[PDB]
């Protein structure tokens, strides 16, 4: 299939060169997979989700996305126009308040919830979790993410927006999950993107159009925006049987676009998420 006039990030992850505008992808579109977006929530009513999004857990007085960040990230996973895997099921877990903030105790609680909750749900192609969040180094938080991965979930977490080594941030610094850095439409490493040896893959992250609260859209920037590209891609490939939850991050990095980003510091991988879809 092909989406003409797609957001540059969708076009990037189906192309061996930047500057293109059509998103080529296998029509399976992540059908039969599930992706937990662990964030400020998801505005499930958004027409862009086509009824494929629901909330399943909140840790605050409401489960509504009063910020937009979570709806923006979910839209990159599986919205019709802004999504990598357009037929995947989205599940919202609100560990972040409407200001974008979340306690670590709460985020750990959310990850443990996902590992268990996946057993209530019909996800015959497998389960992904997208964690566009993080903070300073915490070994409990890294531990929480490794548990979720070990439980059978493909975890992707943002590398961070500190323009620093991600070794000092969490869950970015957990070796067993997929840590996603951000690039721009010109294949530069994004100005804010963290880096370092913990990084596994890069995804589109600067000026990313996606869904927003109030039935709307907007472009924003962050490694929070690169993560759902990789999360959505993992669900896409799993639906296709190309890879499993435990091996998707390695699969994505072995088949990425290699050596094509600029301003990658020494000791950080130069790999850009890529679907290698050949019609």
Note whether 167 and 148 are within 8 A (CB): no
DSSP 235-271: HHHHHTTS--TTTHHHHHHHTSEES--BS--TTS--E
88 is in an annotated binding site: no
Is 26 marked as binding a ligand? no
How far CA 26 is from CA of 29, 130, 256, 276, in Å, comes to: 6, 21, 17, 10
User: Between vectors from CA 179 to CA 113 and to CA 131, what angle results, nearest 5°?
Assistant: 30
- Interhelix angle 69-78/223-239, rounded to 10 degrees, is 30
CB 130 within 8 A of CB 77: yes
Q: What are phi and psi of 47, to 5 degrees?
A: -50, -30
User: Chain-centre distance of CA 162, in angstroms?
Assistant: 18
* Buried-state track 50-86, b at ≥16 Cβ within 10 A, e below 16: eebbebbbbbbeebbbbbbbbbbbbbbbbbbbbbbbb
From 39, 165, 184, 187, active-site residue: 39
| Strand locations in 114-213 (E) | 127-131, 135-136, 153-158, 169-170, 178-183, 201-204, 208-212
The helix (run of H) or strand (run of E) holding residue 175 is none
Among 15, 28, 46, 69, the active-site one is 69
Query: Which residue in the list 72, 79, 224, 229 is annotated as catalytic?
Result: 224
Phi and psi at 196, nearest 5°, equal: 115, 175
Consult the annotation and say whether 184 binds a ligand: no
Please say if 69 is a catalytic residue.
Answer: yes
Residue 224 annotated in active site: yes
153 is in an annotated binding site: no
Cα dist from 204 to 8, 14, 34, 76, 142, whole Å: 8, 12, 21, 10, 24
For residue 166 the two structure tokens come to: 């991600």
The number of helices, as runs of H, and strands, as runs of E, in the chain is 6, 15
127 annotated ligand-binding residue: no
Structure tokens at 18: 């930047």
| Domains present along the chain, CATH in parentheses | 2-272 (3.40.50.200)
If one counts every other C-beta atom within 10 angstroms of the C-beta of residue 260, the result is: 18
Q: What's the rounded Cα separation, in Å, for the pair 276 and 253?
A: 12
Helix locations, the chain, DSSP H = 8-12, 69-78, 104-117, 139-150, 223-239, 248-254
Q: Cβ distance 5 to 63 under 8 Å?
A: no
CA distances from 118 to 3, 36, 111, 171, 249 (A): 31, 9, 11, 21, 20
Question: Rounded CA gap, 170 and 160, in Å?
Answer: 9
Question: By the 8 A CB rule, do 194 and 267 touch?
Answer: no
Nearest to 37, CA basis, from 94, 84, 79, 83: 94
Q: Which residues pair with 211 in a beta bridge?
A: 217
């Amino acid at each position: 299939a092909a989406q003409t006039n797609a957001p540059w990030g969708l076009a990037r992850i189906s192309s061996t060169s930047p500057g293109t505008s059509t998103y080529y992808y296998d029509e399976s579109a992540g059908q039969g997979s599930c992706v937990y977006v662990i964030d400020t929530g998801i505005e499930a009513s958004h027409p862009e989700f086509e009824g494929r999004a629901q909330m399943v857990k909140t840790y605050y007085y409401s489960s509504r996305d009063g910020n937009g960040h979570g709806t923006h990230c979910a839209g990159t996973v599986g919205s019709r126009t802004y999504g990598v895997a357009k037929k995947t099921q989205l599940f919202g877990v609100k560990v972040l308040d409407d200001n974008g903030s979340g306690q670590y105790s709460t985020i750990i609680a959310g990850m443990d919830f996902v590992a268990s909750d996946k057993n209530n749900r019909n996800c015959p192609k497998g389960v992904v979790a997208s964690l566009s969040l993080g903070g300073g180094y915490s070994s409990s938080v890294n531990s929480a993410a490794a548990r979720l991965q070990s439980s059978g979930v493909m975890v992707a977490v943002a590398a961070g927006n500190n323009n620093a080594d991600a070794r000092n941030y969490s869950p970015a610094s957990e070796p067993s999950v997929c840590t996603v850095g951000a690039s721009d439409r010109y294949d530069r490493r994004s100005s804010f993107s963290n880096y370092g040896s913990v990084l596994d893959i890069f995804g589109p992250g600067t000026d990313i159009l996606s869904t927003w609260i109030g039935g709307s859209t907007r472009s924003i920037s962050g490694t929070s925006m690169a993560t759902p590209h990789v999360a959505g891609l993992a669900a896409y490939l799993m639906t296709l049987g190309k890879t499993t939850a435990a091996s998707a991050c390695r699969y994505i990095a072995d088949t990425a676009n290699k050596g094509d980003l600029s301003n990658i510091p020494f000791g950080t991988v130069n790999l850009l998420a890529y679907n290698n879809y050949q019609a």
